[PDB]
Amino acid sequence: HKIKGTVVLMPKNELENLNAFLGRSVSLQLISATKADAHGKGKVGKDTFLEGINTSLPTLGAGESAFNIHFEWDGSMGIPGAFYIKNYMQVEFFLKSLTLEAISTIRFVCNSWVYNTKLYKSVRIFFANHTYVPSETPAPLVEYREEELKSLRGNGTGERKEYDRIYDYDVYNDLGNPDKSEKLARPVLGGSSTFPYPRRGRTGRGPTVTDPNTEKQGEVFYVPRDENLGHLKSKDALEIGTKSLSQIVQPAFESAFDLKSTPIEFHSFQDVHDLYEGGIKLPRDVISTIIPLPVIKELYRTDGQHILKFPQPHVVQVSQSAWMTDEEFAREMIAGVNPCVIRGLEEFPPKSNLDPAIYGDQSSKITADSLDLDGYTMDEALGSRRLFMLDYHDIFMPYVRQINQLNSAKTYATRTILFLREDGTLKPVAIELSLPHSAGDLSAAVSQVVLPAKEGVESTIWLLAKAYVIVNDSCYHQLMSHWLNTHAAMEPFVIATHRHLSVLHPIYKLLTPHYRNNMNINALARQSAINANGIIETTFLPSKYSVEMSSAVYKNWVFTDQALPADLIKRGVAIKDPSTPHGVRLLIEDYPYAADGLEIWAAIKTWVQEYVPLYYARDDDVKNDSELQHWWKEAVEKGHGDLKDKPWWPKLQTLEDLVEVCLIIIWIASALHAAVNFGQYPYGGLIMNRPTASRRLLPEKGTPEYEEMINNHEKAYLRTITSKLPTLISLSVIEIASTHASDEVYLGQRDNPHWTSDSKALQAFQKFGNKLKEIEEKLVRRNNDPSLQGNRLGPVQLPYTLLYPSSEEGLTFRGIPNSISI
Numbered sequence: 001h002k003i004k005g006t007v008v009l010m011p012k013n014e015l016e017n018l019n020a021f022l023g024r025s026v027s028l029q030l031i032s033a034t035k036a037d038a039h040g041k042g043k044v045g046k047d048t049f050l051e052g053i054n055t056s057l058p059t060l061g062a063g064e065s066a067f068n069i070h071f072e073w074d075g076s077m078g079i080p081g082a083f084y085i086k087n088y089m090q091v092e093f094f095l096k097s098l099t100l101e102a103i104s105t106i107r108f109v110c111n112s113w114v115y116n117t118k119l120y121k122s123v124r125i126f127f128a129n130h131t132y133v134p135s136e137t138p139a140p141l142v143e144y145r146e147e148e149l150k151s152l153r154g155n156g157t158g159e160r161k162e163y164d165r166i167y168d169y170d171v172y173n174d175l176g177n178p179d180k181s182e183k184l185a186r187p188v189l190g191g192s193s194t195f196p197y198p199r200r201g202r203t204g205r206g207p208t209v210t211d212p213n214t215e216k217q218g219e220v221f222y223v224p225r226d227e228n229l230g231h232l233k234s235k236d237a238l239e240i241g242t243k244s245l246s247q248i249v250q251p252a253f254e255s256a257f258d259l260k261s262t263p264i265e266f267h268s269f270q271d272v273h274d275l276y277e278g279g280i281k282l283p284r285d286v287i288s289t290i291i292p293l294p295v296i297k298e299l300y301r302t303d304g305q306h307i308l309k310f311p312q313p314h315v316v317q318v319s320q321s322a323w324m325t326d327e328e329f330a331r332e333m334i335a336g337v338n339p340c341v342i343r344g345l346e347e348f349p350p351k352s353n354l355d356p357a358i359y360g361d362q363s364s365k366i367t368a369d370s371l372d373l374d375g376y377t378m379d380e381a382l383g384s385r386r387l388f389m390l391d392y393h394d395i396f397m398p399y400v401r402q403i404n405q406l407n408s409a410k411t412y413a414t415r416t417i418l419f420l421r422e423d424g425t426l427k428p429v430a431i432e433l434s435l436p437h438s439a440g441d442l443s444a445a446v447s448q449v450v451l452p453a454k455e456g457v458e459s460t461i462w463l464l465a466k467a468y469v470i471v472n473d474s475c476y477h478q479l480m481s482h483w484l485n486t487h488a489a490m491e492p493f494v495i496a497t498h499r500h501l502s503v504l505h506p507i508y509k510l511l512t513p514h515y516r517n518n519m520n521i522n523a524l525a526r527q528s529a530i531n532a533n534g535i536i537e538t539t540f541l542p543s544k545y546s547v548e549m550s551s552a553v554y555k556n557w558v559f560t561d562q563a564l565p566a567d568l569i570k571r572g573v574a575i576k577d578p579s580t581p582h583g584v585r586l587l588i589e590d591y592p593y594a595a596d597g598l599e600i601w602a603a604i605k606t607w608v609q610e611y612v613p614l615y616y617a618r619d620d621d622v623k624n625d626s627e628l629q630h631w632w633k634e635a636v637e638k639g640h641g642d643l644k645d646k647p648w649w650p651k652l653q654t655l656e657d658l659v660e661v662c663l664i665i666i667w668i669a670s671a672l673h674a675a676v677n678f679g680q681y682p683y684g685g686l687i688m689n690r691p692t693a694s695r696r697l698l699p700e701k702g703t704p705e706y707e708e709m710i711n712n713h714e715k716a717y718l719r720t721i722t723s724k725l726p727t728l729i730s731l732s733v734i735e736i737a738s739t740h741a742s743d744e745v746y747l748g749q750r751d752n753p754h755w756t757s758d759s760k761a762l763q764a765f766q767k768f769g770n771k772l773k774e775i776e777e778k779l780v781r782r783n784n785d786p787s788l789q790g791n792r793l794g795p796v797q798l799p800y801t802l803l804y805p806s807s808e809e810g811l812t813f814r815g816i817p818n819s820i821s822i
């Protein structure tokens with residue numbers, strides 16, 4: 001007459017004795033999926049308490065404890081499909097799972113914090129691991145299913161508390177700190193035509209005293225409780241790093257500089273190399289402040305007394321000087337940290353769409369006859385699809401004036417012309433350094449064109465020109481390729497999924513692994529990374545204009561252009577070609593990001609195309625899923641609501657649209673983010689290779705600054721790029737971001753083998769993981785192919801492993817997480 005059950009939970013201390021969980025501490029009630037009361041709701045059993053510690057199980061995961069329990073459940077009550085749980089203890093615990101035996105085995109995958117019962121307005125409910133579209137929900141669970149969605153949505157008011165599980169939207173009005181200073185006021189991003197932006201998770205702290213449109217500061221930025229990931233190992237809590245760096249480590253660094261205990265500036269390139277060789281000497285109390293901090297202490301080796309040493313960046317591990325080569329500068333545009341901006345150039349000279357009345361004549365000054373195209377004429381280079389560009393002219397020109405008015409910031413709007421050589425590598429052939437020009441200008445600095453040069457002061461000017469380009473590129477990488485296109489663009493879909501797709505829903509099960517830790521890292525970023533005077537503003541060129549620049553770019557963000565084939569075709573780096581395996585022909589055949597990416601894209605596509613038909617037999621079945629239609633309607637009209645008028649949104653009335661939408665979401669969250677994230681320290685850990693800021697324009701002839709370019713080119717370079725103090729802070733941030741936590745869940749993995757009971761879904765997922773293993777072998781062969789050495793390894797001899805699916809923990813330059821997790 002009893003159902004044997006096993007509860008697995010983790011006491012709180014395991015993620016930030018066992019006998020306290022016995023007695024009347026924890027009650028569970030089974031809920032029937034087949035026998036309903038007179039209202040049609042599945043009947044509920046009696047409160048049943050944990051009976052004892054099970055120590056006979058083969059071996060739980062670390063930190064987990066198993067509890068025995070027996071439910072009076074006579075069979076007339078039908079088959080359990082859910083349960084209620086009440087925690088009568090003062091302290092919350094993490095509920096892993098319930099397992100019921102000898103009844104048609106029943107598994108519940110919970111993985112949820114359960115706070116004291118008096119904190120909840122309705123009792124926590126958990127469903128068995130079956131999957132149902134809404135029309136397939138067993139009738140006695142239909143109302144339970146919808147009431148749980150209503151509970152997760154909340155009502156759009158109230159200050160969110162730690163234990164709340166309420167998902168909702170708000171604008172980016174929480175970055176400014178106007179109550180501290182008018183200088184820290186920031187425009188609201190989202191909800192206007194001037195500043196469109198993805199929505200983020202609502203926190204509801206309320207208004208500042210000086211500005212009803214800006215949300216007040218808080219010690220903790222709320223996320224729904226189970227988004228805030230605990231870790232067994234403190235060192236895996238990498239998301240706490242940015243707060244520690246901004247609030248604890250940066251002031252300690254600043255004091256070392258204020259007290260003149262270390263040189264204020266780098267004076268040679270070797271001063272930079274020293275950081276990962278002998279290290280940097282700092283005051284004792286500065287070391288003492290840093291080396292006890294979780295996560296932070298993992299970033300540096302130390303003698304415990306005066307030395308911090310950074311890890312040797314991958315980009316210098318074979319050749320310290322290879323970053324300086326034109327070969328490597330161009331190669332990193334297709335296999336570097338930001339491999340997804342280069343475009344084909346199909347006319348010459350390049351054109352601008354900006355208004356000459358505002359910025360002056362926008363004609364390019366690059367002349368065709370000045371370029372070395374390995375003997376090709378311009379017409380030949382254009383017609384054979386060998387001309388490409390890295391075009392930041394129109395992106396940066398609207399912000400150059402305001403950036404350059406800042407005291408220690410000076411930039412150009414840059415364009416780089418690239419030629420695809422017959423050997424398949426890219427060659428840079430010109431850089432245009434543009435400045436706006438209008439009648440009222442007080443500056444006499446002018447735009448100019450710089451061409452490659454290997455000797456003399458011309459070689460230094462060309463090296464500086466490359467630095468100005470990479471400052472543009474690093475800013476666009478950090479704020480657009482990375483922050484906007486992954487972190488910020490994904491959060492609206494996270495929110496919508498939890499608000500409108502039941503945990504029971506097949507598309508919830510398909511997508512939610514790809515959201516792990518995303519809202520958490522994003523909230524911590526709003527607090528410490530992209531806030532006024534936060535990490536990004538105090539290390540990157542645009543300073544207080546950084547985040548709003550990403551809103552300007554979001555005006556042109558197109559959901560369907562995030563698909564890899566559409567991206568490659570839009571950028572003119574591939575053409576449609578049905579005769580090829582992936583339906584596109586690359587115009588740069590050995591384009592490592594794109595060629596490896598197409599393999600990953602195709603594997604995800606096959607997986608989604610196999611999973612969707614398990615639950616939707618026909619287009620009509622997609623049309624008639626009420627949760628799915630509400631999910632997509634809200635994702636578009638609210639989550640990305642500033643772009644809800646755009647004609648390119650899929651309608652989601654067909655199987656093909658459902659596949660496309662899920663495929664793109666998974667792609668952004670896993671491989672796209674990985675490709676743009678985990679190369680940050682490997683390439684940018686040498687500040688000269690990936691400068692974050694430029695502080696001066698090119699010097700005029702006849703000046704001491706010009707003579708310095710002749711007599712001391714390294715110092716000229718270092719004075720132009722990011723200063724030493726923001727370099728230390730920035731290196732630390734990108735080292736965190738390039739690190740895989742040991743509890744990461746990678747593409748092809750899931751945190752629990754029982755996420756669904758449907759064997760066809762589980763077998764399809766196994767095929768997907770096998771396919772990713774085969775792809776990794778293929779990518780290994782690519783990196784070992786000497787014919788591809790030029791673009792896949794370069795003179796830095798750094799094999800392109802960023803789209804290898806698998807990785808061990810640490811700073812590995814490989815591995816594709818499921819989600820945007822750091």
Ligand SMILES: [Fe+3]
Pocket residue numbers: 482487673677737820821822
């Ligand atoms: Fe990231």
